[PDB]
Amino acid sequence: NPVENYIDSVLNEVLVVPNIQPSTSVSSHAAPALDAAETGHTSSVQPEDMIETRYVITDQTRDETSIESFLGRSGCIAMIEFNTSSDKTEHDKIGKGFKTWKVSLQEMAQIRRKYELFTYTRFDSEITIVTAAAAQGNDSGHIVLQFMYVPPGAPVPEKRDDYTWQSGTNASVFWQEGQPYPRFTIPFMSIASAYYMFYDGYDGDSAASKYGSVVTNDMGTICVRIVTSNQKHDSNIVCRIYHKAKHIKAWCPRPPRAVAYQHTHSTNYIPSNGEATTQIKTRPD
Amino acid sequence: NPVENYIDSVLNEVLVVPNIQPSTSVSSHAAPALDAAETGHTSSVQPEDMIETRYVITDQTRDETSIESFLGRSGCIAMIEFNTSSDKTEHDKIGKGFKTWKVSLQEMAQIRRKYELFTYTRFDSEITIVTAAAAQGNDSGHIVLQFMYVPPGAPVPEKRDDYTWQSGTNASVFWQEGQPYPRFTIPFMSIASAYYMFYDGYDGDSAASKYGSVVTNDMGTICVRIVTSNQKHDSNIVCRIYHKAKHIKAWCPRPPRAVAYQHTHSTNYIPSNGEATTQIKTRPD
Amino acid sequence: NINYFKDAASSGASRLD
Amino acid sequence: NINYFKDAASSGASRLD
Amino acid sequence: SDRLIQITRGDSTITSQDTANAVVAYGVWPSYLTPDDATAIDKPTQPDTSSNRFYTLDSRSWTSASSGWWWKLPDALKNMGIFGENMFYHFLGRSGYTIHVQCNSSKFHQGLLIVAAIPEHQLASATSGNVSVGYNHTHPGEQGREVVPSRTSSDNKRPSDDSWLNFDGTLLGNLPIYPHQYINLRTNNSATLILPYVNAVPMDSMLRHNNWSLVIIPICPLQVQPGGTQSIPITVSISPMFSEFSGPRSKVVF
Amino acid sequence: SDRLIQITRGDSTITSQDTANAVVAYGVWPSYLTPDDATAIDKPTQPDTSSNRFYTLDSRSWTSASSGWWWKLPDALKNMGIFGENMFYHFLGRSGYTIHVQCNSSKFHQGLLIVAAIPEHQLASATSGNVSVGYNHTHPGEQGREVVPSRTSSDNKRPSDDSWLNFDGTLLGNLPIYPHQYINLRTNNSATLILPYVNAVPMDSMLRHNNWSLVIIPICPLQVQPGGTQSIPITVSISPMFSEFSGPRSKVVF
């Protein structure tokens, strides 16, 4: 009955863990302690096979290690920065009145490393926006922002009041000072059945052809502007984009990243430094 | 049962697409590949008629190409600008304390081009207002705006505190700084059964008679004022009017606009420039 | 589907056809 | 569980498996 | 006897008398694409016995100095009989594989190979900067790549040779999370991996994308006393399984 | 309308709007080999849509001087896509064919081609003595052979060019005993032959034996007045049907 699944869900008891059964001394030709790891299978041996156990009613649950629990938390994926101007000519320009950001999960290591535990992932994305407009003068002025999602092949804005900001077909969300953090869902939007966290392939046959997950699905661009025209007092605006996966599926688990990331969409790990090589978290003894 | 239509609606599976049936080699007097386009009908031939197909269970849906999906998105249709004054005499004047805008879908090309894919359209209009008041001095002051819809033949305001702003019969909406974006519906309001996107007709028989869709239905005027009397620090106010069609019907599809718009309610396309003629998006090779 | 306002035009997007 | 929006993707976290 | 295997694929048969079972990657046996998951509407060609057969790749010598080897699939088979021709004549293909890795020795040799199949083994560069690994380097064909300690070359398109970082910035000790077996010379003389088709699309360009990488890394070096054979071959035999191709066209030429 | 045809084979489609029916040679439609008649015990590969599709051969010009043309099957298709690859990689093959011969003209051109498929068209030499026709001469590939009046060469391995003796010591007027159509320019712009596999063995070496010969002979010369197109192409398109191959091996090299 669905009420049992609801009660288990509010208790976080959906994913029950086996009890420890009582065991006793054994003298047998069966040797659970011995196996062949050469098979590629992990030994099935459990505590009851190798020590005399008591009965324990196991209270633990695995709900918080579900992939929905593990990946389904909001983390920063972009910091989008622009510095407004009192000059009408400069306020129209990129980096001043508006900024663009090529969408990916690749720029922030905390999120990137978690999703890269899997080869393929499929999820809907909850986006939440945290804007902080640092006043450089004696007043904030009126702060109204527009965030426009520009899909691949749609025209990207080149000016703060370009025709593209009309948003006649693109999704836009508006934010003004004192408004709660903007939030919207992007449904799972790949042309494939899952996102590639990794892709051992190319966009072509040639020396110049691109390699890796960047080939597989262009994710479009977030464009942000201040909607307000030029104002007396400048603002250093930073919009932080937070992403939570929802309705998550993940396939083909991978070793975690063991060394610093160097570049987006690349497994490259060799640093630029000539004295310092790539560093692991294995401590010597 | 209505629950099936609800489930299809939340999945976006209302408009199912045919499966590809399996096909085999054919040798016949029937020649699906041959037709007469002179008839004005498009050939009915499908992949199964011209290649050996496998069975494919087609997952695609047409929900997002519905006219409700295509036209039912908020796009900018006006930018209404006025610059407030600290001078009590100047703050009363048009362009300073208040502004008027003759209603149409004609001024912003992104919306205009989409609706002009059809000859006639019928919809209710959701209006949303995005106000950005750029502070020109050290403070915003108290910003309260009134947007008044003035139907055809109702008296248009000539002063910021004229009697017409009493709004005893006109619809007005008030906005103040920090208030969420104003929103209201205008029902389908033509004297005809649909809006004319195009009209091959005149308001009269004479050389001076107007031609085209401007004849067919005057849409009234949005009047915006700052309700606040004159204040110490000026504001460059821009109100952006966003329009979403709802409950949409559309008739008689048309070729899309292939060249820049030149004027409102006019199909004219010849630019003012003597070196540069009208430009298409057909690239040479 | 609950309708909060007294006018048919006030409702959200129509069902697909 | 009440769903306020017309898209499956708009719903909160899915049930565990 | 659980030590024995015979695998018959088309007109090809492989035997081993000292196996350690076989691994079916992710517990899924290979199969043909079903209509529910298909997108390409053309009837696929299923070349069956002429394609789904063992091809033996070029053998490599395991020495006390060896660092590892890898091959890419389907790339390692691009020159291999009717399977290879079908990859060059079709826009799309899909296949599973049986990989059989062969390495006999004596009761007096010591050594441990991990044999792993990695899906989407996107390689790191051997050089600093954002320069990605070149197409020709990840497409070595049936020769595969031999890993060399402290390898010197000017070519910034070459892949990482750091087998301890999986050639990709992840630790070798975690490689067992991928479908794998070991060849431990005291235990077994072969490893067998059965690989389903694994991809986020139901079929793909065979020449543009390697779905699987076969990685063979000596973890415990080859050791054997004087008078014993000081270097032993590693031989890889691979059979396509349920191979399918679609979108026939003119042959690709590099 | 009995004038029209469309034939769809794999991803290939042919149309004609002025046919004269089609001939199924000996009234037997092509099919796969049954277990009752088979001898080779290996499971055959049936490459289906990637192999059983139209390949268009090199076009030839019909002039008022032309004497005829011929092609051999399977030889004419040995370089043609996946069918051609399967012939080179397998000891044995069998196929039927659809042959579509294409030759449009105007209401003002005159001419008659016989289009015949001959089983076991064992050619005569162009020279006296017992010297037989050479392999390279009966294996011209998709170009076929063009017949030339009074052709001069020293090569005693070359075939007869006597189209009036069927290149084989039998009269052209009796060629209609073979599966045939005509292209009579006033009537039709194409001929269609459907050929079953015909042989005294259930499968055969594709490269050693041409089961069928396609012979095209102008009986009534091309005639057209000034201002009309003075020479018209003949184009041959051939689809394998129910192609099967067995005994996969390394690729044959000449």
Place this chain on the structure above:
Amino acid sequence: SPSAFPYFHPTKEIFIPGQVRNLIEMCQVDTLIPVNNTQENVRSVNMYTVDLRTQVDLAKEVFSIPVDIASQPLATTLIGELASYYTHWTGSLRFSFMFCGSASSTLKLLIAYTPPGVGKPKSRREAMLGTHLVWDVGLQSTASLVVPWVSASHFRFTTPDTYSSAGYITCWYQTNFVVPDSTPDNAKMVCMVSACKDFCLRLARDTNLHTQEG
């Protein structure tokens, strides 16, 4: 949202012919492809006409285009224009060719679709290894090539992308353009495109095919 006109009754909806419920109904209508698109022709009806004439050499090429619906020259067709309001597309395309020579003119053409991975075919022999139609010009003046949906992924981008590109159409002489006396030795063909029954567009976007300045 509240109505600004709280008792207003809209004008009766009368029947109007030609209601459109979905943009795919418009994509399913043939529109002419500006295949010729040379600098001399793009200001004229001539961009929609492909020249055919009696060849001296066999198996010559007539024209080629990319098949990707929002690439040039397909971009300004109705299906290309509607596709450019969307980010993804899928399903089969119908290319139709109408021969406009005389009734006394005869021709065969090989029209071929070549999938990605080999570039454009350099000969009729390369082209005929792909999906193709041999078209006989006769009493029916129009033929259609279906470009079947053959893709790794369920959808392709409408914007040009080397991972997502759809391949090429090429047209070749099969035989020749043959005429009697008193007939022009040259003619025009008109090329058209429309959607098959499986065709869809997904993620709505601003078009790249129209801009506003001022």
Place this chain on the structure above:
Amino acid sequence: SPSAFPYFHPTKEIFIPGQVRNLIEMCQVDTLIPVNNTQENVRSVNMYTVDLRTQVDLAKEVFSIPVDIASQPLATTLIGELASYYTHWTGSLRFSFMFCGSASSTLKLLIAYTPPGVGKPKSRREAMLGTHLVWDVGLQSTASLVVPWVSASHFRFTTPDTYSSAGYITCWYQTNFVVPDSTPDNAKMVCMVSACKDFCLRLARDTNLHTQEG
């Protein structure tokens, strides 16, 4: 929350092998422990191999490690890496040892888990008073020691804490590494770790095992 793409239908979910529903499925897979982890070995496969050889003295130590899953050297194993995304852990651990000598080599080892409160065992005699396995090296080349969950509290911290520490594994010669002629007098062992059926992780956190600068 509202969808930004209001009629969008996602691409069909196809079957893909290897779906993961829970991180404990990954913790239940053996991964190699870098037990050797000296400065000479941490850039190499050699960190995963423990040296065994014929001893002159009896009952010598082979290696020792702390058992706490996110402590060094366990930290960079898959279970240690996943545990370091969580604040608490509980349940039993399986340590597996694969002998990589020759088939002609013989050995017994005593592998012992020592609970907290006494430090690391200083001898095999101290170690064998704890939970232990006497492993005979034979035709089966792998043995497993289970570290049973023996704790005062239901959970332990994954970060090192003297109140929460889990104790030690030590390995000792039981008998000796014995070989005939023409056999290397030395060999390697590979050590692995995975979760038992009772193993769980609780309170999710940022990992201490990965950082970003710039």
